[PDB]
Amino acid sequence: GLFGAIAGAIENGWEGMIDG
């Protein structure tokens, strides 16, 4: 159920994978 919520952040979490 959490992994499903993480997606909520993933909306901006990807921003982490941006830098590189």
Judge contact between 13 and 19, C-beta under 8 A: no
What DSSP letter does each residue of 3-15 carry, written as one string?
Answer: HHHHHHHHHHHTH
Dist CA 20 CA 9 (whole Å): 20
Residue type, 19: D
Dist CA 1 CA 15 (whole Å): 23
Helix H or strand E segment including 17: helix 15-18
Residue type, 5: A
Experimental method: NMR
Residue type, 18: I
